[PDB]
Amino acid sequence: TKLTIWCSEKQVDILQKLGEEFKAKYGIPVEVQYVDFGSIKSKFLTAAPQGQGADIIVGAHDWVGELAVNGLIEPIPNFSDLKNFYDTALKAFSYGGKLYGVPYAMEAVALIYNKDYVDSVPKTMDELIEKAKQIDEEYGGEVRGFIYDVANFYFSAPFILGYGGYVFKETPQGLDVTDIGLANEGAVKGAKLIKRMIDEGVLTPGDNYGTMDSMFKEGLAAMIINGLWAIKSYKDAGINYGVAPIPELEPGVPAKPFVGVQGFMINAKSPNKVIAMEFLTNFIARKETMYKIYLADPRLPARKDVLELVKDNPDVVAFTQSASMGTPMPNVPEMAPVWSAMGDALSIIINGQASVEDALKEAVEKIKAQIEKGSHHHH
Numbered sequence: 016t017k018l019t020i021w022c023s024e025k026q027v028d029i030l031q032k033l034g035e036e037f038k039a040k041y042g043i044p045v046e047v048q049y050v051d052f053g054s055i056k057s058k059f060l061t062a063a064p065q066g067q068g069a070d071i072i073v074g075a076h077d078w079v080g081e082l083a084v085n086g087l088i089e090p091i092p093n094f095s096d097l098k099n100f101y102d103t104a105l106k107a108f109s110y111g112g113k114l115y116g117v118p119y120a121m122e123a124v125a126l127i128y129n130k131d132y133v134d135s136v137p138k139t140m141d142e143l144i145e146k147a148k149q150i151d152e153e154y155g156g157e158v159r160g161f162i163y164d165v166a167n168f169y170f171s172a173p174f175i176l177g178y179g180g181y182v183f184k185e186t187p188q189g190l191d192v193t194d195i196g197l198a199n200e201g202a203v204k205g206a207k208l209i210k211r212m213i214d215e216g217v218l219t220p221g222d223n224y225g226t227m228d229s230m231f232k233e234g235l236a237a238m239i240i241n242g243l244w245a246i247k248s249y250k251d252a253g254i255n256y257g258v259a260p261i262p263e264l265e266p267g268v269p270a271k272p273f274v275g276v277q278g279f280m281i282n283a284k285s286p287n288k289v290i291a292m293e294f295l296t297n298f299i300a301r302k303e304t305m306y307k308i309y310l311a312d313p314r315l316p317a318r319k320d321v322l323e324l325v326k327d328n329p330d331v332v333a334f335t336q337s338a339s340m341g342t343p344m345p346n347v348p349e350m351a352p353v354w355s356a357m358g359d360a361l362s363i364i365i366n367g368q369a370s371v372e373d374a375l376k377e378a379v380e381k382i383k384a385q386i387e388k389g390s391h392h393h394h
């Protein structure tokens with residue numbers, strides 16, 4: 016008997032240490048395997064039905080609907096510590112009236128800046144663009160004023176949603192997946208701000224997560240958009256960084272980032288699903304274990320009495336402010352095609368292959384086509 020876990024590099028060390036604690040207390044060995052975050056869900060979709068998925072996976076709550084309706088993750092039973100998690104975090108992991116994960120953290124992106132180049136937080140996106148241009152000119156191109164994973168809808172959503180875009184309409188009967196707002200007037204305005212930054216040379220079409228992240232660590236990026244998951248690596252790199260909400264899109268109009276919840280899900284096909292569930296509900300969910308996880312991966316705790324311990328940490332304060340005007344990612348099965356359609360639209364936009372209106376129109380048509388053909392149903 017061996018419990019297997021897949022998780023990104025941010026959680027491997029602490030989960031292997033906790034796994035040794037669990038073995039010391041219950042005699043069940045735990046094997047934690049690094050999987051690059053962007054491969055976890057895709058690998059689980061193909062491996063789990065073959066009996067080759069991990070017993071437990073760690074990842075983001077938007078996966079829940081797709082995995083649940085495909086029979087791949089197990090509903091979490093009631094347990095004594097359930098009450099101790101924020102309802103926002105539990106709702107993110109709930110679908111169709113059932114909880115499908117034990118959450119450990121809540122998150123949203125923010126503006127992260129290097130104080131070697133930025134002395135005050137730009138008050139608006141127009142000010143940010145001007146400061147970034149100033150930096151690009153002042154240091155001769157050696158330092159990037161602003162860089163982020165621009166073609167990735169997760170990171171460009173703050174602009175698209177902030178102006179009034181939405182994924183699916185909220186209704187008293189749940190999300191209406193036939194009412195898609197990713198090509199509305201606000202979505203277009205937000206994507207046009209992105210294209211304006213490309214036009215003014217503040218962003219480039221080749222910018223991606225790795226180029227942004229390594230440049231910031233090297234001390235050669237003044238401003239980026241990233242989450243609290245990366246702050247430990249910037250501390251280790253020696254960057255004197257600051258954190259603030261993404262500057263207002265217009266005076267008095269905030270950016271609207273996605274809110275994500277990270278948590279543990281149980282493979283419904285696993286022969287070890289009973290003990291895996293016990294590991295989550297009776298061990299991972301404890302206050303002591305959740306605090307150990309925070310110290311190693313210091314995202315906002317999903318457990319209220321753990322957040323209370325760390326509420327004055329300046330990173331916690333700044334990322335809480337950034338998330339405060341955000342919106343949680345949808346977790347319905349129909350969220351599955353949204354990422355690729357909008358990512359393709361953003362690539363088209365930043366490469367000048369089509370107008371913003373045409374690219375977003377095509378993205379919405381693609382999403383509707385994927386929903387109508389049931390792209391979220393695998394068999």
Ligand SMILES: OC[C@H]1O[C@H](O[C@H]2[C@H](O)[C@@H](O)[C@@H](O[C@H]3[C@H](O)[C@@H](O)[C@@H](O[C@H]4[C@H](O)[C@@H](O)[C@@H](O)O[C@@H]4CO)O[C@@H]3CO)O[C@@H]2CO)[C@H](O)[C@@H](O)[C@@H]1O
Pocket residue numbers: 023024025026051052053056057075076077078122167168169224242244275354355358
């Ligand atoms: O079609 C493209 C891909 O679309 C889907 O990926 C989505 C995810 O489902 C979303 O959750 C989100 O991903 C975020 C993530 O929520 C956020 O935490 C952050 O990820 C961190 C990670 O937590 C951390 O531990 C470490 O590993 O670094 C990651 C960042 O590199 O950022 C993610 C965004 O990159 O958005 C993506 C789309 O970008 C789908 O699940 C994929 O299968 C699909 O390929």
